Amino acid sequence: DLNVEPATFVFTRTTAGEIGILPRHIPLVAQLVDDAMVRVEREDDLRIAVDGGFLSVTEETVRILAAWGRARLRALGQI
Amino acid sequence: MLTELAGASALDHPRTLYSFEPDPETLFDA
Amino acid sequence: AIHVGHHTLVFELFGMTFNGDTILATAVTAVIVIALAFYLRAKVTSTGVPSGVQLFWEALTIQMRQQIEGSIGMKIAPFVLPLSVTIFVFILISNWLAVLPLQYGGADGAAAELYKAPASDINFVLALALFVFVCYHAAGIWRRGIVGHPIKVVKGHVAFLAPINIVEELAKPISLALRLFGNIFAGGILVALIAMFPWYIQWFPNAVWKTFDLFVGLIQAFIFSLLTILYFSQSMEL
Amino acid sequence: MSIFIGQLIGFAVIAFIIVKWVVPPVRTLMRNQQEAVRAALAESAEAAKKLADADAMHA
Amino acid sequence: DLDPNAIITAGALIGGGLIMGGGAIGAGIGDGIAGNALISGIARQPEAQGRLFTPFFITVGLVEAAYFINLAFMALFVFATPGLQ
Amino acid sequence: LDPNAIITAGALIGGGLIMGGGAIGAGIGDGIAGNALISGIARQPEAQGRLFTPFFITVGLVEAAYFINLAFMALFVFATPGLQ
Amino acid sequence: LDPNAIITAGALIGGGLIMGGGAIGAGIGDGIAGNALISGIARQPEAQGRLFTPFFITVGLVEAAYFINLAFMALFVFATPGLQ
Amino acid sequence: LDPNAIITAGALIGGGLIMGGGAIGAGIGDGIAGNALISGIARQPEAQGRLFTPFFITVGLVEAAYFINLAFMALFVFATPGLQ
Amino acid sequence: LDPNAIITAGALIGGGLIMGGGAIGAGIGDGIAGNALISGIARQPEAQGRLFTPFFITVGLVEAAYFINLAFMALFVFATPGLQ
Amino acid sequence: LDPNAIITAGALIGGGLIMGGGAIGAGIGDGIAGNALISGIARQPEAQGRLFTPFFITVGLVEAAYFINLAFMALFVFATPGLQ
Amino acid sequence: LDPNAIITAGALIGGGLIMGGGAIGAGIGDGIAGNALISGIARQPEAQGRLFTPFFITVGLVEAAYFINLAFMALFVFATPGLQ
Amino acid sequence: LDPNAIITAGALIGGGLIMGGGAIGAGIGDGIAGNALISGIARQPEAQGRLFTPFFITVGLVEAAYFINLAFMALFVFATPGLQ
């Protein structure tokens, strides 16, 4: 598994596009989209409205350091 | 994070390589 | 029967053959260009609102000067500025005059054009390309010396690729000429092909092709000028 | 003759396309450039007058 | 036997067809690649739209040339066939 | 056999070569340019307006070459040079 | 040797070349455009609606040439130009 | 030389060209579409389910071409146009 | 001469073209799909199991075409259509 | 004129086509797969251990086609079908 | 049949092949190098002068091959080796 | 004309096809593998020491193909199968 700051999957939208992180994903630094949403699936999936975050995938850990409204709607499912 | 961006990016803002979704310079700027 | 080549008004002088049609087309283009130049010289103004001719001429000058300055200092190669620009306009006019409806029947079903773009003649393109070739090679010799310049061109960026460099140099003129040639030559043929259609069907494909050929001629003039400036900058360094 | 008429109609179509779609934008570009240079000249004259007024007032 | 010029012209037509086909393939693919670069560059930043058309039209000039040069030679084989006897 | 038969067979094969090459070039170039355009539009919707400017230029060149072939093939097939 | 035999053989060769080139171009261009579309859909799920429009355009062009080839192949073999 | 022999040889070569071009186009187009699909799934494993709808479309536009060519091969080799 | 010899030579050339096209398409398509698979495995090793599914489809979609060509090349060289 | 001579010439042309297509496909596919592998190793120096698994699969799928073509090429020149 | 007729027909076909290959190679290589140059210009306004030195090295090679081919075409066509 | 003449002409054409295909494959595959190596070295200058290991493999798997073709080309030209 991977340490999200334990989970199984981390779905997120970056400036490049939608990105999903699995346990051994390569190291990565990305900028979350202005209205980004984070879905952490662990052995129910937690949905977070992240605004202006930064994704940082490491060998072991994944750190997630009108746009805000859209992020809220996406997190709560209205999109 | 900023140190990792700077190490693999141009310093001109006014083992395993980190992957950067957009180019390193834009992330460094933001 | 398509009648490729087949220059008209061919005459002879000093044991040399001259295609009269090509000379006439080139003369008409030169007359148009000189008329534009003299209209500018008459209406050139630094204080009043510029006329359309001045706008066009200064747009061309600004363009060519920008590429020159980017590639090589204008002070280093000022003489490149006129040459480049004139080349452009020359070629441009030589192509755009082809849009005029000067195609008629040849009394045997073969289309004949009163005016044919001179670039469709190998002599015109070869003259322009060889003049540019000699010009920038002379500029390179002057900048680097009669003995130094050949050494630089043969050795090029990397000396171990000396043979390729030589070939590359020989590729500069012909690639400049033939390219232009083909760009116009094909058009000269293509319109003739469209002439095989009946008028009530010939009008449309001819219209489409000539509308596109306008842009083709513009792009070819621009490419010739840009590559001339490029070669000048390449041959004047260090 | 026949092909001459066909190519004449083709040139008429070309001229119609030009006048209808290409002439307006290029004419607008030329007008914009003329207005810009005229405005620059007007600003230059107005700045000269402004300096004259400032010098007269000061002295 | 058969008229030599017939064989000459058949070979000339085959060669010209090969020349034009190769030129068309090269021109189309190269122009597509250059246009891909141009469109992607404009997408990445609109303000660069002015500075891209200069290198781009150099590329086309270097690319499209290969087409028309061949075209010229194609005509040479087809309209004035070398060794036509 | 009639020499014109040989001339026409050669002309047909040459025209087939011309059209095949033109089709390959047109298809692949249009596909590449359209890939660029589709990716650009996917990245940001706003660019849809501006991207169409270079795209039609690209096509404008690519397609043009194809149609040139489309004409020369006719020259080969309908009015064969040196038919004699 | 029947002249028509040589004419038909040449026409069949040319039509085969035309279809070969057309299929190569159509297949590769459709593949490239579809690659762009698939990447866009994967990265931007919402962009799908605004991606089918440009994609179709590309496909259109890519198909156009191919279908054009079709016609001329049908011309080459069924009604061979220059037939004696 | 029986005229039918020449016609059949030409038709067989034409069919071979048709299939060669079709196979090249189909293989490369399917490969490129598959590259897009695999890259999309690797970047976003959950997206797999929603990436088949575009992918298939692309494959369609590829396979169709190939199969169309295949059909015409039959005409060339089994009911040869212009065969005497 | 024997017409069957001409027909056989045409069949051999056609089958050679079929195999050439099939080999080009299969090799390049498999290379592209494998490039995608290698890149995806490099990016997300834990997605390996999820990536072989589309990969096998694309390869399955590519090799299929190639083998279809075999199914028609053998015919050409073993049951030649129109052979006398 | 010996019919076997014509058949052998056709077989040689067919074998040349087979091997040319196989070489093109194998070379380009191997190059693409190796490009993927080299980029993956460049990004992850320690990833090679796993990247060699899919890579060898890709090559396995590519060379396979090549060596099938070679086999059939040997069936063209050494035991020519239809050679009387 | 005149030996020179067949020899020079083969020479013309060979020169056509030389130019077809040269055109394909030059066009595609120049397109690729220009794609690199355009990308570099797009993401670095001031890199133009710096990127031209490598660019025209690449072109310096690409064009060279093309023109070498052209040279040999002349030898093939205007002074055919083995002509008699 | 002697049968050896036709057989040797076919052998020469087949060898030319083999060499052309092999050269295309080798050149393009080596170019792609290079592109990968240059990109990797640009990204990680120190990685060169390791990057040459996979690269060679790729080049190997490419060059082999080419050189294999070479052998068969000789077999076509110097000891022609089926020669009479």
Added chain:
Amino acid sequence: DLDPNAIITAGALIGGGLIMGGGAIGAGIGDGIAGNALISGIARQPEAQGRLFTPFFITVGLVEAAYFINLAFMALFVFATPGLQ
């Protein structure tokens, strides 16, 4: 009735044309790809201009080699044609 040497020479010329066409395609495209990589690398790291040449040329060294090998064999086909009677 026909000279066998004529047929052999025509076949040799077609074979040499194929050799050169394939060699030119391979050389042009491979050099274009390698140069694309070199240009991208120099754009990313201007300081790497001298470092990237060692791998770049190696690639070219392979690419051109294949091409020139073809060239040699073309000289064999057309000038000293194997199988000439």
Added chain:
Amino acid sequence: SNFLIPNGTFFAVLIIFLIVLGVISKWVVPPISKVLAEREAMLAKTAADNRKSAEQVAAAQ
């Protein structure tokens, strides 16, 4: 009917083009460069004049 062989016109065209070049060298490009340079001088003088007028009225107080 070779149309690729150079003819006598290679000189004739080379003359006409040269003539045009001459005109463009001495009646188009020099005047246009002078007009442009005067225009940038005018713009710079206007900007400097505005700043100087502001500063000079400020110093007048």
